[PDB]
Write a protein that binds this DNA or RNA. Structure first.
Length: 69
RNA sequence: GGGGGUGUUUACCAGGUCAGGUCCGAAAGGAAGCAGCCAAGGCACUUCC
């Protein structure tokens, strides 16, 4: 369950804004994402790292559930 | 080494363009700019000098 699938699914607009800023490797293997990338991703989608962490946390909560069925 | 070609590779660290998103502005409109692509670089093969 990659960030892409998570993207399939008015604040939601900002969630996308943030995923459309990652690379295909990022969208595919989220963990590789750390400070540096975050800095690029947020600033790329006019967001703050927190928003990214926010989304990143969201996705996590999401993936987790998936890995339970 | 240089020119040409082919395959491959490359998050950000003063190339270009800029979906999405952001910023400034009452507006009209300005600004920066991620991914992408183009470009460019790296690893080679080929061909010419």
């Amino acid at each position: 369950f990659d960030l892409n699938d998570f993207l399939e699914q008015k604040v939601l607009v900002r969630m996308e804004a943030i995923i459309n800023s990652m690379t295909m490797k990022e969208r595919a293997k989220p963990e590789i994402i750390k400070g540096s990338r975050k800095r690029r991703i947020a600033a790329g989608s006019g967001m703050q790292v927190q928003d990214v962490n926010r989304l990143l946390k969201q996705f996590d909560d999401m993936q987790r559930m998936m890995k339970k069925m």
